[PDB]
């Protein structure tokens, strides 16, 4: 026995509630792991997540490290488990609510998010290839922060995978999946062409722009920073409906406000420009995750980030 298995894991602490199923911190062979538990009737959701996390060549420093899918029978019922790396800081949402970040800190968070999304989006054709994957629910609550101050993308359960050879998506995609607040304009107004996989990648980029705005607000320079807020906190109620979002994003054409103080700092001017170029209503005009990664890599190099 060398591989990680559920019978050898001891749950220690409740740490979150997933889309479906509960999240715990557990100990496996002296190490801390995260465990997400589903009931037997949630087998479809558990299986789909296990399937995405088992995708060939998925592993990357900025994608949640998956360990195993398993079952655990306690003698009364069977639990369906997913086991992954554990990150003490939790989500980027938790981290930004708790702390302010330095310019260096902000670039680290943004660059790592873009690098993880670029890998998710990347198709590798051939032998041990990799299908392009679109997230469909990117947001700050779905990104974790590591001890080294970098991010890893998580909550891949709603992802869609593309097969290049047949130009097909692995599932029959349902309309308007995802957190309403982060839905792209084309998803909100249902103009999205769900037969073109590039449509999904473009919608992820819009959501990434919103996450970058959340990070930038928390960047503290000379003690100057904004308070933590979710995108559109100023325009929509908590738990907004598709109709509430559509009226703001599609009809009124509003985006999160880019404050004047972001023009005084080079790192913030770069971040603000990226946000604007993620927020275009026309998905085809948006930057790619790879282009953003390149821009932010050049910036981190200029700042001398360790």
Binding residues for ATP: 15-23, 36
Nearer to ligand QMV, 34 or 111 (CB): 34
Contacts to ligand QMV by CB under 6 A: 15-16, 18, 23, 34-36, 49, 53, 64, 66, 82-84, 86-87, 90-91, 142, 144, 154-155
Nearer to ligand QMV, 64 or 267 (CB): 64
Q: Which residues of 193-226 are buried (b: 16+ CB within 10 A; e: fewer)?
A: ebeebebbbbbbbbbbbbbbbbbbbbbeeeeeeb
- CB-based contacts of 298, cutoff 8 Å, min separation 6: none
- Helix, strand or coil for residue 29? coil
Shortest distance (Å) from residue 46 CB to ligand QMV: 10
Nearer to ligand QMV, 20 or 233 (CB): 20
Cα-Cα end-to-end distance for the chain? 38
Nearer to ligand QMV, 88 or 167 (CB): 88
Shortest distance (Å) from residue 230 CB to ligand QMV: 15
Nearer to ligand QMV, 20 or 280 (CB): 20
Residues annotated in the binding site, as ranges? 15-23, 36
Shortest distance (Å) from residue 154 CB to ligand QMV: 4
The Cα 178–Cα 284 span in angstroms is: 20
Catalytic, out of 8, 70, 73, 137: 137
- Helix, strand or coil for residue 289? helix
Distances (CA, A) of 195 to 160, 170, 265: 12, 12, 41
Cα-trace Rg, the chain: 19
- Ordered alpha helix ranges (H), 54-174: 92-98, 103-121
The Cα 34–Cα 26 span in angstroms is: 6
Shortest distance (Å) from residue 65 CB to ligand QMV: 9
Residue 264 burial (10 A CB sphere; 0-12, 13-18, 19+): exposed
Q: Is the dihedral of CA 173, 176, 180, 183 positive or negative?
A: positive
Is residue 167 part of the annotated active site? The answer reads no
- Ordered alpha helix ranges (H), the chain: 43-53, 92-98, 103-121, 185-188, 198-217, 242-246, 266-278, 289-303
Active site residues: 137
């Amino acid at each position: 026995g060398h591989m990680t298995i559920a019978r050898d894991i001891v749950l220690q602490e409740s740490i979150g509630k997933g889309r479906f199923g509960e999240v715990w911190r557990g100990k496996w062979r002296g190490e801390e792991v995260a465990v997400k538990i589903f009931s037997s009737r949630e087998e479809r959701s558990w299986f789909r997540e296990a399937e995405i996390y088992q995708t060939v060549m998925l592993r990357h420093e900025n994608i949640l490290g998956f360990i195993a899918a398993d079952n655990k029978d306690n003698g009364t019922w069977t639990q369906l488990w997913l086991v992954s790396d554990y990150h003490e800081h939790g989500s980027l949402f938790d981290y930004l609510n708790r702390y302010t970040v330095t310019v260096e800190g902000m670039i680290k968070l943004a660059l790592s998010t873009a690098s993880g999304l670029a890998h998710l989006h990347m198709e590798i054709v051939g032998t041990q290839g990799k299908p392009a994957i679109a997230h469909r629910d990117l947001k700050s609550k779905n990104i974790l922060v590591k001890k080294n101050g970098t991010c890893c993308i998580a909550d891949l359960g709603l992802a869609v995978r593309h097969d290049s050879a047949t130009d097909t998506i692995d599932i029959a995609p349902n309309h308007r999946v995802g957190t309403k607040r982060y839905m792209a304009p084309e998803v909100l107004d249902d103009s999205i062409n769900m037969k073109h996989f590039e449509s999904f990648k473009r919608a992820d980029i819009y959501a990434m722009g919103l996450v970058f705005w959340e990070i930038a607000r928390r960047c503290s320079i000379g003690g100057i920073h904004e308070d933590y807020q979710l995108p559109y906190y100023d325009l929509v109620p908590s738990d907004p409906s598709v109709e509430e979002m559509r009226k703001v994003v599609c009809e009124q054409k509003l985006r999160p406000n880019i404050p004047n103080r972001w023009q005084s700092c080079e790192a913030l001017r770069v971040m603000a420009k990226i946000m604007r170029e993620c927020w275009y209503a026309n998905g085809a005009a948006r930057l790619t995750a790879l282009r953003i990664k390149k821009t932010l890599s050049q910036l981190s190099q200029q700042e001398g980030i360790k």
